[PDB]
């Protein structure tokens, strides 16, 4: 009779109906993503259409229950998620056109090939071919060729697509009552109905910038230490005061500097804290990697993977037998169906990535009993953080020693701890200016602040200014270098990787305090701690039933993102870098270019 | 004189749970332990009895109710349970003496693309009393505004399809259920063990 109980019954209907239409859309996308074909594009489009039409009719009905008369916070949150129409606010033609743009971009990204000047019919994809060069090559010209071919031959294809994607996505967002697509994306962090726990979309930008100010000195000094080491790695090619050339950073973009470890290792004669060589000798394969991640989670009291996960996941590249999207993704298809899609290799990079993606699955499994609309991370940063909390413990030398990837007589120095902290920084700290800069560029594009003829001009200015990275080839407005990264051409928010990285240390403090941990945070391994497992799981199982600000406070005792646990984790490395750099330039000038 | 349990347990098609089927069994010998090891049943719970003890009991009739539900819901086929299945579809009494038997039927009842022929009742104005059976199809009035056997705002067709895809998690997979009630009246006990 009352509105709240009418809404309860309406959600009852919706949850049951939604689950099968979502699941059929997930299966169709899975088919496309493991088997790129035009037939599978059209099935993904058909199931996506069916789901969006249903969502439009249902959200129209949900919006008839005034939220002003709803006491149940969980009933209010579910109805809040149905307050906008969504993707269906585009006409049939524009919606068809938008889909075509997204499918061409995603197909181009993981099937596009570049071919050699030297060889007319060798042909390399991004994955594995070009990524292998960008991760292992020590040759300036080989790395430059892969970095430039990718952007010249594939990025140019994406530029006109990306221009119209911006237009249609913004139109969609304005009809959903946002300013633009970027504002829409920042909505993931909005919290409205809860006194003292609210969070406006505008607050996120200020919190990202204010907290990034506190990360700059650590990054400046990591940057300076890397730049000094690269000078001997690439004689003639590195200015002592300039930005780093964009193609010398260890992957196709410099998103992480992890693969610079071999060049920048503080104490190279200590036992190797990178366990790649060790797992290759021990004949590890993808299966043993994912079995080891599974045993880690079971050690803290969380479940095994399901049978269907082991049966239906794609954990290695299927070959040229069929074309996959190799980028590691954790899938929650619905109805108890959980999968990872990943082209795993025998590297420490993929060992840690296996732990992090499985952590996301662990999260998905923990909130599966939540009603359909709250089956989600408390925000995108929470969902991106869980796995990284885990890999923080899975990466510790003590953990690697206990799974047999370090000698059973491996002994920890101040030197091995600095090695570990340096490698950790190359991944975790190196990505933060990368991540903030990429997303601010997109936010500026979305709000209409960069004329089309200055897209790439502003892109490279912001790389130089914020990131201290410089393009090795001048680039036209025929390029679209941001879209050469998976997340830009596959339409994913990116600031999740910024907020996640601050969260993961905030969480790790609280998990390690639950595990009664002895000493500094970077020596902590939550393995075998079911107390730590319990505190983590109790947050995981909430899904989005609580605002992320209250959810965060329940674990860590703070309502907001906070940079201090990250800075404290890296403090011993920060002290070391400052002493290492005392005879080196620190900071960068944006005027130097590799080209002239 | 063996009882025709095969007709029930090995039937090709099973009823939807909202329209559960009942077979009366009489004038025969039932080996309940032979039936116990007749397969691997995921659930085989007897409430006022034990299987090995049933083979020395006699009843005037046995009733075998059969239907399909998902795995998550097999726990509702027990006395004192609540939930959609127990409240609106199939209710066992509190004083139940009988056996609940279930097995995974994913390989028979799920279909690529989905099998949707199995229904359950999602809404009802009150709870079924034990062994009651509701096969009506009037539109459920969830609101003030009186509907009209027409779905609309606050008005829902009361039955829903399960959706069984072989890729579902085991909780979501189809399970076939057989409930046995043992009846003894003041009349010749015509269903006996060996
Ligand atoms: C890939 O898709 C085609 C149709 O798009 C299908 O016939 C084929 O069997 C699929 N390949 C694999 C390996 O599943
Ligand atoms: C309403 O909220 C209470 C707690 O406040 C919760 O137990 C209940 O399940 C909610 N309503 C429904 C239909 O779940
Ligand atoms: C989308 O939802 C809004 C409520 O915000 C509603 O006004 C509108 O009618 C819906 N779309 C359609 C079908 O017009
Ligand atoms: C505890 O974890 C260590 C490695 O961290 C492992 O060697 C050991 O077997 C575990 N012990 C138990 C009881 O799980
Ligand atoms: C069902 O069929 C199998 C195969 O013929 C048979 O062995 C089994 O006894 C049957 N079950 C019942 C309860 O009769």
Numbering used by the authors:
A (entry chain A): 19 to 614
B (entry chain B): 334 to 527
From the paper:
Guided by the results of our initial SPR screening, the ACE2 mutations of S19W, T27W, and N330Y were further combined in pairs or simultaneously in the context of ACE2/active-site-mutant (H374A, H378A, and E402A), which was observed to also slightly benefit SARS-CoV-2 S-RBD binding. The determined affinities were 10.1 ± 1.2 nM, 13.6 ± 1.8 nM, 76.7 ± 10.3 nM, and 19.3 ± 0.9 nM for ACE2[W19/Y330], ACE2[W27/Y330], ACE2[W19/W27], and ACE2[W19/W27/Y330], respectively. For W27, it projected its indole ring into an apolar pocket constituted by residues F456, Y473, A475, Y489 in S-RBD, making 35 vdw contacts for strong hydrophobic interactions. Sterically, Y330 and W19/W27 were distantly located from each other and devoid of any steric interference. Our structures unexpectedly showed an ACE2 molecule trapped in a closed conformation in complex with the viral ligand.
SARS-CoV-2 recognizes, via its spike receptor-binding domain (S-RBD), human angiotensin-converting enzyme 2 (ACE2) to initiate infection. Previous studies have shown that the human angiotensin-converting enzyme 2 (ACE2) is a functional cellular receptor for SARS-CoV-2.2,13 ACE2 is a type I trans-membrane protein with a large N-terminal ecto-domain, which can be further divided into a peptidase domain (PD) possessing the carboxypeptidase activity and a collectrin-like domain (CLD) mediating ACE2 homodimerization. Several structural and functional studies have shown that the specific binding of SARS-CoV-2 to ACE2 is mediated by the receptor-binding domain of the viral S protein (S-RBD) directly engaging the PD domain of the receptor. Since the viral recognition of human ACE2 is a key event in SARS-CoV-2 infection, the soluble ecto-domain protein of ACE2 can in turn function as a decoy by competing against the viral engagement of ACE2 on the cell surface and consequently inhibiting virus entry.
